[PDB]
Amino acid sequence: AVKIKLTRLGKIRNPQYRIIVADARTRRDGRAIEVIGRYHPKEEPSLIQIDSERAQYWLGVGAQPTEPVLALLKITGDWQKFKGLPGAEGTLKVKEPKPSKLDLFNAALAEAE
């Protein structure tokens, strides 16, 4: 059975994962058929990217997500779109962008004068 797993990357303290499609018999860090997203739980909103069409294709041929990957697929709405139960709603909480350094630079300059 081909499965949609999470392989581990990053250094010791900070695990950063890749959402890979691979056979269930291969090791965690083995060769991957495809890479269809990444997942970084160390961030405050825990960035999640999933390539929707490839995920749809791999679910269509019958890949089985693991529990963390199933949770992620529900969050991004891909799982619901594949099934069709509540609709395809994006529940993804994207990280709030940080203002530019130039904005703060001019703000400080204006605050000086």
Binding site: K101, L104, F105, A108, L109, A112
Partner: protein, 200 residues
Amino acid sequence: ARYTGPATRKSRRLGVDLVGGDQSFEKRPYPPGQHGRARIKESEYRQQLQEKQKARFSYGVMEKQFRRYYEEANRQPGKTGDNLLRILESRLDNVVYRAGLARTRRMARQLVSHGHFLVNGVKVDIPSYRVSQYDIIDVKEKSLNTLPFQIARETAGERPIPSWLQVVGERQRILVHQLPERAQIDVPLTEQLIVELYSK
């Protein structure tokens, strides 16, 4: 580690003043030790090495760090000499010193290492920290009333602040517009000699 021994020794050996305003170097501008008066044999290697020692004892950078800096500067697509000079100038302690907030580079390094400063809203205590464009270096509120910063904030008539830096706040804020170019560096010595030495 760090170099803690006498500072005047290096100035006397290298034939130039590195602190900037020291009277002992003027009193005796010749190398230290018993044989500080002997004539020397001339060798290109000696001149290149002394130029490198000047550079890395002005900024207080050890040899391994200096070699890393040279590799980084050579890798960059500019020219090696001014790239190395700008990398050396972008250090946090050097920025603090050129900002008029420290009489000498050693005390600037000591202040930075003690975490008396704060870059971009987050405490930084790393003398080798490199400073990028539009960087705001601030003194933390607790240490604003200390005597070092006191005498730094009431003697703002010393060495001019270079163009690429600008103190804007009465609390002695520092703003960095862009990384300095070779024209505005205003440093002793010759970068070409260092480049020649490190290609040997």
